[PDB]
């Protein structure tokens, strides 16, 4: 069973956009959000409970707890989807 890297990548981009759509739907502060996501993904800064729920609401589970090697993660996919939307 050959795995399709493009499909996998497409799905993550899609689950992320569907997730971003919801966050825009729920009036979430987005230029706000870039920051919590950026500081979390680089500095492993602990994610705000404020927004943990907001993400959990959108189905995105906080948080990248592992120091293991990630083939993918919803948070990383989302962070990319954000920056696309805000230059």
């Amino acid at each position: 069973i050959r795995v399709d890297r493009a499909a996998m990548r497409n799905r993550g981009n899609d689950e992320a956009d569907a997730a971003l759509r919801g966050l825009v739907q729920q009036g979430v502060n987005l230029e706000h959000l870039r920051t919590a996501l950026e500081r979390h993904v680089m500095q492993r800064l602990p994610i705000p409970l404020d927004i943990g729920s907001a993400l959990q609401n959108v189905g995105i589970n906080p948080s990248i707890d592992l120091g293991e090697s990630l083939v993918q993660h919803p948070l990383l996919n989302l962070n990319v989807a954000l920056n696309r939307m805000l230059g």
Binding site: R44, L45, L76, N79, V80
Partner: protein
Amino acid sequence: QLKRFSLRELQVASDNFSNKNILGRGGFGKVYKGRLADGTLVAVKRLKEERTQGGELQFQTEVEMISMAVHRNLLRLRGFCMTPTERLLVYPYMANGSVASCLRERPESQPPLDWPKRQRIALGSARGLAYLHDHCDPKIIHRDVKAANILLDEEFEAVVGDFGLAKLMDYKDTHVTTAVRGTIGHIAPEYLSTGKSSEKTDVFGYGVMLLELITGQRAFDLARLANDDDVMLLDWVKGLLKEKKLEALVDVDLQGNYKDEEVEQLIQVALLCTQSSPMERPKMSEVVRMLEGDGLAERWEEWQ
């Protein structure tokens, strides 16, 4: 052809995967020490029993990568095993385990990793990467450069190890669009934000690896400390280098057995490698020349 092992062969090599033989653990699965029929030592990577797509993508990638890179500083996949229920990869045994395994996560009372041995790792592992970037066609971005993926043989020669997350890139491209994959803290800021990687993400990952090598700690441990001062890890390290508070950084376990000038130069390579600007970030071959002797002071001056 790549050697296809039977599950039984590896069962026997490993003592039916006895806990006595485990070298490493993770969500990915387990790594057992083994001995083949002909007394060849090997490390067998048994993937977890759950057939998720992450592991599968990694398994296929490591297998395909076998004939695309050969170099004394790259771990070479000796074989695989694929039963319905099982995914296994087989490697040459590395007597001295991962660099990370020697760095304070090291068990019990294992002898500290001497400083000159850390400089050798920095060099050897830099050669492996330089090779992946400059002399492979297409270019290979490893995408998971970190202390855990650098293995040491009985002479403590460095071998870069895991190609599950590797990415082929057209030799002529400046970037390739791909999902963000890797280890948090070793992924480059531009890659994180755009999903467009290049060899320069590897350089960034290497730079952080060196912090692990100098500090004796995981990139995660370091992050917490930088925050305590409410500063970003890189501004923190840069700040300590500039204020000569280097004692605060260096692996305490090294005691003091190291030349203060050597360590600093290594930190400098680290910082040059982790610049937010990919184009200012040195090529991995420049890093190799730098570590060998040539060009550091100048490139570090062009820093400020």
